[PDB]
């Protein structure tokens, strides 16, 4: 067994302290990314801070699409598939901006007879998907760190 415990942080040491920037910073996605970044010990700074030369995470467009994945024998919907796509950029200052993205897939069976309950379920799925958007964005951080060295 060549396995061993992980020795490197999930977020790279270069991006230990960083700025979270977004046009909707009170929204659910900004809250989820802030919670994840605080989880890995990342120090979040203010946008108008005087501290320059720190990496900046700018959250971009977020779109949620609910469509029909399957239908019954009568043509009515059976599975509703919800897809969340999130775009963002990581600005390494004086070096480059690296675009990253996250895509989250979910599905659930419709039920008109308890449709209001299903609506609540749909809302719950959305509050999960943002977390899945935040997990994927954090794991792409070391990808950006490796790409920075390749620029030379």
């Amino acid at each position: 067994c060549g396995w061993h415990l992980r020795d490197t942080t999930q977020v790279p040491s270069t991006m230990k302290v960083m700025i979270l920037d977004s046009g909707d910073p009170n929204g659910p996605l900004s809250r989820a990314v802030r919670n994840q970044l605080r989880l890995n010990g990342v120090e979040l700074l203010d946008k108008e801070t005087t501290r320059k030369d720190v990496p900046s995470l700018r959250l971009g467009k977020v779109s949620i699409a609910k469509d029909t994945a399957s239908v019954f024998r009568n043509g009515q919907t059976a599975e509703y598939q919800m897809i969340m796509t999130v775009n963002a950029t990581v600005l390494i200052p004086g070096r480059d901006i690296y675009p990253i993205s996250a895509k989250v897939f979910r599905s659930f069976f419709d039920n008109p007879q308890m449709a209001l309950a299903k609506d609540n379920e749909q809302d719950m799925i959305v509050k999960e998907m943002y977390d899945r958007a935040a997990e994927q964005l954090i794991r792409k951080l070391p990808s950006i760190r490796a790409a920075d060295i390749r620029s030379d």
Partner: peptide, 10 residues
């Protein structure tokens, strides 16, 4: 039961 329904287990 007003707005409680079974959830998928992915």
């Amino acid at each position: 039961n007003y707005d409680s329904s079974l959830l998928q287990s992915d």
